[PDB]
């Protein structure tokens, strides 16, 4: 690939060199390797989380009594786990022959924690088997270890799918990069109150923005529009996971 | 126990003798054995199932596509299974020494099917592990076999707890008899629309009547009022099973 020509930047004013951490350098190499290997598409969708949110908020005491804080991440993790089993092509990886998919029968999901040294993506194993307060506790443990440089490489391995949430900061949508060899990543941005047509008038509904990027060699446009459709439906009534 | 004196019933008019099936005779002996062994109390409670009902009704297509019909029995079975694990004294039996309880670590639940030959109580094993449509299908299979005299004694064994539902016929509450050696049985009667105080005015809420009878040697009044309280809370928001 052609390199970028170097520029004498000091010709235009004062410059200062600061170095990158090794974590950043690893980060950079992996993103660029994903970028060039994966033909990326992003499918955008909005989910109605008005009731999910009122559930989250009422279980605040139960959560506090358990010493965990119930955020949105466990509710996303649980729904994505159910879905990674309903639609197994999203839970798989392209075999190195390029002629086979390796379907995984396990669901482990990573989540992006941006730390000062750089990006870490801790993995929660068997997300399909744990409960909202278990996932709540573990997510928080893993993120604290990640921030404290005390996360062991053991916990950064063999994820199936990644959730990347920037909802705590802002934004409307973004296009995340697939964390190859995984085949998809869900970006989540900030929920807003929004007018939604009910057949007669517009009703304010709390809308969550989802941005699914996927590896188009393995997932086609319709499979991906179906994944964000189902996910928006599960987040609108999470009781459907019960059936 | 003193017997009832025989009466010449034909002295008062015409009589006819019809005989009881062996099933009825077994039924009769067991009820009387339970009656005399178990000091019975019944704890009554009403659960607000307005939203559970609207869930049930919306999943009608999913259920039809799966070939099952989603009634209320699976939603009761799932909630009682969660509860039989939260409050383990309800999932146990009095040891024959009378000085120990045997706590069971498995949840299998029976349910009363009244058939022409008499009462049968088929058992669904590991209710805690199956899903609403799995329990829906199995419940219906078992009840058809029960009606058809094709249920094998295998499926009438080792239940932990019994649900007895007469909601399909009518009534306000009743006092069921504990199916000993189990320690409790939930009777369910007919749901009605009811005014419920919201702090300001009365709101119509669809109320389900529950009648828990229990073996008072093993369960005390407060443990039982706590079981129907929790069950009414889980049926009001079944998503709490998720956490
Ligand atoms: C469990 C944990 C790992 C992730 O939590 P989270 O789901 O991001 O939620 P947080 O509590 O961090 O979010 C901060 C606030 O923004 C809110 N927020 C989160 N997602 C939101 C969304 N998508 N839309 C709008 N607001 C959102 C939170 O609910 C929270 O509100 P509060 O301060 O009133 O409680 C958390 O303990 C943690 O470490 N948080 C730090 C932020 C982070 O790195 N998140 C990465 C998730 S991929
Ligand atoms: C799954 C099965 C075993 C039990 O079903 P169920 O939960 O009793 O529900 P049913 O569909 O039989 O009930 C008949 C109707 O009364 C309704 N009903 C049931 N419980 C009710 C309640 N507690 N309050 C008010 N109405 C109720 C049902 O929802 C159903 O309505 P529909 O005809 O409009 O669909 C069912 O297939 C069956 O065999 N039913 C026959 C009745 C029976 O023996 N039930 C025993 C349960 S312990
Ligand atoms: N884990 C890594 O070392 C590479 C960076 C992560 C890939 C995704 S999270 C990029 C999101 S935009
Ligand atoms: N199973 C039996 O043979 C005995 C009868 C059942 C006990 C309960 S269901 C009575 C309910 S009122």
UniProtKB/Swiss-Prot annotation, chains A, B:
Q: Which residues form the active site?
A: 216
Record region (Catalytic): 1-243
Domain of life of the organism encoding this protein: Bacteria
Coiled coil (UniProt feature): none
Q: How does it assemble?
A: Forms a 24-polypeptide structural core with octahedral symmetry.
State the protein's purpose.
The pyruvate dehydrogenase complex catalyzes the overall conversion of pyruvate to acetyl-CoA and CO(2). It contains multiple copies of three enzymatic components: pyruvate dehydrogenase (E1), dihydrolipoamide acetyltransferase (E2) and lipoamide dehydrogenase (E3).
Q: Which family does it belong to?
A: Belongs to the 2-oxoacid dehydrogenase family.
Protein name as annotated:
Dihydrolipoyllysine-residue acetyltransferase component of pyruvate dehydrogenase complex
Give the species.
Azotobacter vinelandii
Q: Which residues of the full protein are shown?
A: 396 to 638 of 638
